[PDB]
Symmetry: C3
Subunit: 150 residues, 3 copies
Amino acid sequence: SLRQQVEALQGQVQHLQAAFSQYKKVELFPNGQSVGEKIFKTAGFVKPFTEAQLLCTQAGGQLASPRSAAENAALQQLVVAKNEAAFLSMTDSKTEGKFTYPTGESLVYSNWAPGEPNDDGGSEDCVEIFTNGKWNDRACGEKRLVVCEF
Amino acid sequence: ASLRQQVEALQGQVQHLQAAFSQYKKVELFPNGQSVGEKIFKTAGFVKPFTEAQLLCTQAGGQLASPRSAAENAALQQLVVAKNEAAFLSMTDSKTEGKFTYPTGESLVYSNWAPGEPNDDGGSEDCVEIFTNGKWNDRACGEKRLVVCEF
Amino acid sequence: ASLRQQVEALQGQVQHLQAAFSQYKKVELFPNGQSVGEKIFKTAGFVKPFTEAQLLCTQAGGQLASPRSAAENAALQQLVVAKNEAAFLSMTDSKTEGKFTYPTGESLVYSNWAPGEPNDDGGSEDCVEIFTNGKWNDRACGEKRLVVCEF
Ligand SMILES: O[C@H]1[C@H](O)[C@@H](O)[C@H](O)[C@@H](O)[C@H]1O
Ligand SMILES: O[C@H]1[C@H](O)[C@@H](O)[C@H](O)[C@@H](O)[C@H]1O
Ligand SMILES: O[C@H]1[C@H](O)[C@@H](O)[C@H](O)[C@@H](O)[C@H]1O
Ligand SMILES: [Ca+2]
Ligand SMILES: [Ca+2]
Ligand SMILES: [Ca+2]
Ligand SMILES: [Ca+2]
Ligand SMILES: [Ca+2]
Ligand SMILES: [Ca+2]
Ligand SMILES: [Ca+2]
Ligand SMILES: [Ca+2]
Ligand SMILES: [Ca+2]
């Protein structure tokens, strides 16, 4: 009796593994990118930084925080697909010239475009990622593609 | 004996699925879904008249948004606010004027009518819209409102 | 005693996972997907030329929509109708004019050609579109059509 029910449970789990794997592909198409244990997903619209940040946090995630070249490339895929530069999570709102993650931690990876960050006009504390994957500091009030990470 | 090996094998596979799925739930509901209790609301992101909206939801295996508590109403309001578009609810007094019912025919267990509503304005409001402030208003079923289904 | 109850507990967990997964699957497919048998169609919601469309689907781990039966065709037609945009299918006769094949090179097992089609109009129609009425027409691959992938 026990072997009969373990065999049934094995069939259930194998079915679930197959169905779940299929569903993951469906979900990520066309607005998500999985890299390592992280998933980026775009909302497909633009918002100013504060509104974008709230959308991600309320969804149970945070704004895209690429922490390696591989993460940056995956994010860049969404930016290229939508043809809209995106906000990253990181700001120097606390200490000018020192960019940090929302937790307050200093950057462990950067991909700044030449000459950046430059606090242009003395008022750029947010960060956008271009279709070329490079970063530029930009005014937080500008509207950029919303991309969150989970 | 070898069944012990198997049960321990399944425990590991189940743990992986639970964890992987937990992450995908959050991803999936961003930005057009809202979970509340065991219910999930999901917007199509566009507007339709009632009959068309109803059909979309039922064909998808769900039904138009049917908030049955203040908590559900607040969750739905989150999507309405996010989209900045009033939505249809499932409920109508199409069968008996003045008596609003769910698609099953059951009477309301919860309502959040704006003051003075429902008023059957012009003698022809049999559907219900939820505003960005979360209040309800009866409205002509012919009007186009945000499509939000529950699953 | 220990092993039988572990089976019982583990199966309650799997069945709760099955239920949650089923719910999240319905949510996922509303409004841009359709399931039919073991196949799932999902639209990107925009138009692209064939080569671009094909690449999007393959990069996503699927392929362009490839209806292999009347039931599959009807499922796909729902999305086309919902978007009101004709969609590319995966199949082409680029290799041998007049002989439409799937990406694997296999000849068609199902077709739903509109009257008069395929006609290779202008001498250069090697891709396939599906209309809102579910019928197919051969069309120039350079044209832009709704992107619908299957998984
Ligand atoms: O953030 C600024 C801004 O995008 C300017 O338009 C550009 O000329 C600067 O180089 C850049 O630092
Ligand atoms: O009850 C309300 C109210 O009468 C409004 O003034 C009218 O614009 C709406 O259509 C109606 O539903
Ligand atoms: O077969 C069709 C048909 O002849 C249409 O009139 C033409 O507009 C399309 O391009 C062609 O593919
Ligand atoms: Ca500053
Ligand atoms: Ca700055
Ligand atoms: Ca700058
Ligand atoms: Ca009436
Ligand atoms: Ca009425
Ligand atoms: Ca009214
Ligand atoms: Ca040809
Ligand atoms: Ca041809
Ligand atoms: Ca033709």
